[PDB]
Write a protein that binds this DNA or RNA. Structure first.
Lengths: 143, 60, 63, 131
RNA sequence: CAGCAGGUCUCCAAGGUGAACAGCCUCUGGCAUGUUGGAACAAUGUAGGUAAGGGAAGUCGGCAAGCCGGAUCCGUAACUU
RNA sequence: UCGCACGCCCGGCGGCGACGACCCAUUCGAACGUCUGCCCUAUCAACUUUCGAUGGUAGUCGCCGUGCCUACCAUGGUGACCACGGGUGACGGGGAAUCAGGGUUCGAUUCCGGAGAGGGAGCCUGAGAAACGGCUACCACAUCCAAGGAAGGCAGCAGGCG
RNA sequence: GAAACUGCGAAUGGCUCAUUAAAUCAGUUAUGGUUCCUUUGGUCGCUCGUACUUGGAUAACUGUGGUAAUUCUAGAGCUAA
């Protein structure tokens, strides 16, 4: 079922080994007026790199992006189309800085084309410094 | 070869040169802080037990 | 008359016997015969060789 | 003042010996040994400490394609010192020198034999280690 | 010209090692070492080997001898039909 | 621990400091991080990956967060929105010159931030160095020498040679 | 009060741009993911178990010098933090 990794998988805050006679879970609000999702509380998973149920806090900047790849485990790759004006030739240039953000399995139905706001945090790997905060649905296509 | 002997009870020291390898056979092949019977150093050195500590070579 | 201890075996080498070996970087090794000479040139550790003195200093044999 | 005290010589004409100095040369092709009168079908051989005529095969091109005098400083053949010790240096080495005994180079890699030092005092000046 | 190391068309093909009906050892089957034996181990020989250091300087000529060599994983140039 | 005036009771009580200290805040910072901005090249179109390249689990080091490093899981990550590679008489910026305007060229040069003392490699002390008018090796250079050995880094100040 | 033992600085400054093409560098940011010499604001009888000051080693100095050569070094007599 769960805890298929090498060591024991649990939240560092919780403790269930006290003398008995559902498992307790610890979470946190994120700030800047973003809600806490329902399944991060309801679920039984753990993730130390999640800004809701892990030892990481969002600080600095908060930006957005659109998902283009998901072929990794527990993280995705986003696309960031931004426009830059050139002073000499008075026209715009199409540039993007695609980079990976850590998608926790707190969200389940994540598809292509979804706009996802993202928050700066401490570096958790070589190049990722971001985590998925909340996921908005795509333009239509409910089915 | 010179012998810069020293006497810690009074604090005096003198330098004596010896031009005989037969005189120096009892000193050779001895390490730091070794009691060496120095009764073969001469006629008037009888019963002297001396401690060898080493000095400088022919280059300094 | 300087008897001096073999580099591989550890036996005393009398001045009329033995063989002198000095590698390129600058250090000198001493061999009593070609029996000890052939082992050192092929990277053989004396501590794994039973008949040397260093085996007896490692296994605490004799004495 | 200093004699030769003949040693075991095992580097004939045609041997390539490595350069143990900083002239930029790598190897030395022995072409002839200076001082050997010769014998019918006997190849002129050189031991350590003999002035020898060499030629660079690979290395700096301004030293190649010409004849250089050399002095052997290391050899593979085991030779007998007068006190009765048999010495070899796991390689054959030589340095580039002129007729007076002055090095073209300035530094020596590896040891130099003791009998090479006293016949050639200038070679011993830049020798890092002896024997 | 012979009980001549030559030549002469075919059937069957054990076990092990090993890709193999290759080379080596063994079983069934066959034999006394191939027109004789004994005693020593001289030179020169024929057939095998080994050599410190150099590595073709030998020789018309790398002749002979010597090096590599099986398998697995990489890697593999110029040229070209 | 030390130094300077000096007092109160009938041996006991007190002053002004310096110095260094266990720890929390200040300052100068330092390093790790985010977004955006860089010259040319297709006669560089596919690049990178068990020789961490891309994420996860668990560890080591570290001042801590991290494939910074280690064993196992997935073969991914990037590129025609020009990736990778190569060259750059490329340290960068604030800025300087010419200019209607739009720009172009220069920017090592007194300010800021980065690098370095011939080259990399390694290091003690010291809060702070991988220092170099500090060390340990090698390479290139190179000084004295009695031949046994010692000793050096002006892309600093002036100055000498090429 | 020479010199010496002991602290701080010598990681500041001056020179140059070899190297370097999202790398340095320039603008907004965070250490909620760490240190911090010196300076300043504070705790510095909070602990429950010879003090009227403990111990023994050294440099300077006296003396031997070794060397061709150095900001090279030791033996004997000490003494202070």
């Amino acid at each position: 079922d769960i805890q298929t990794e090498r060591a024991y998988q649990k939240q560092p805050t919780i403790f269930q080994n006290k003398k008995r006679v559902k498992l307790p879970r610890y979470y946190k609000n994120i700030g800047l007026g973003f809600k806490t999702p329902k399944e991060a509380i309801e679920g039984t998973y753990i993730d130390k790199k999640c800004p809701f149920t892990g030892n990481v806090s969002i600080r600095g900047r908060i930006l957005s992006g659109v998902v283009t790849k998901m072929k990794m485990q527990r993280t995705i790759v986003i696309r960031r189309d931004y426009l830059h004006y050139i002073r000499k030739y008075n026209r715009f240039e199409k540039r993007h800085k695609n980079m990976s953000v850590h998608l926790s399995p707190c969200f389940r139905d994540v598809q292509i084309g979804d706009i996802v706001t993202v928050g700066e945090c401490r570096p958790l790997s070589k190049t990722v410094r971001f985590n998925v905060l909340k996921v908005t649905k795509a333009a239509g296509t409910k089915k | 070869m010179k012998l810069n002997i020293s006497f810690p009870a009074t604090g005096c020291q003198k330098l004596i040169e010896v031009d005989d390898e037969r005189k120096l056979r009892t000193f050779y092949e001895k390490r730091m802080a070794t009691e060496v019977a120095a009764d073969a150093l001469g006629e008037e050195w009888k019963g002297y037990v001396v401690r060898i500590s080493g000095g400088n070579d022919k280059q300094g | 008359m300087k008897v001096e201890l073999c580099s591989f075996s550890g036996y005393k080498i009398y001045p009329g016997h033995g063989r002198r070996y000095a590698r390129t970087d600058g250090k000198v090794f001493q061999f009593l015969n070609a029996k000890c000479e052939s082992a050192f040139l092929s990277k053989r550790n004396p501590r794994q060789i039973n008949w040397t003195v260093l085996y007896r200093r490692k296994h605490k044999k004799g004495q | 003042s200093g004699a030769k005290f003949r040693i075991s010589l095992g580097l004939p004409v045609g041997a390539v010996i490595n350069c143990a100095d900083n002239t930029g040369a790598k190897n030395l092709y022995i072409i002839s040994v200076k001082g050997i009168k010769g014998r019918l079908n006997r190849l002129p051989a050189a031991g350590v400490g003999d002035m020898v005529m060499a030629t660079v095969k690979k290395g700096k091109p301004e030293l190649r394609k010409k004849v250089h005098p050399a002095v052997v400083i290391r050899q593979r053949k085991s030779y007998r010192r007068k006190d009765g010790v048999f010495l070899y240096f796991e390689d054959n080495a030589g340095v580039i020198v002129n007729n007076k005994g002055e090095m073209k180079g300035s530094a020596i890699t590896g040891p130099v034999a003791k009998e090479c030092a006293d016949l050639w005092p200038r070679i011993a000046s830049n020798a890092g280690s002896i024997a």
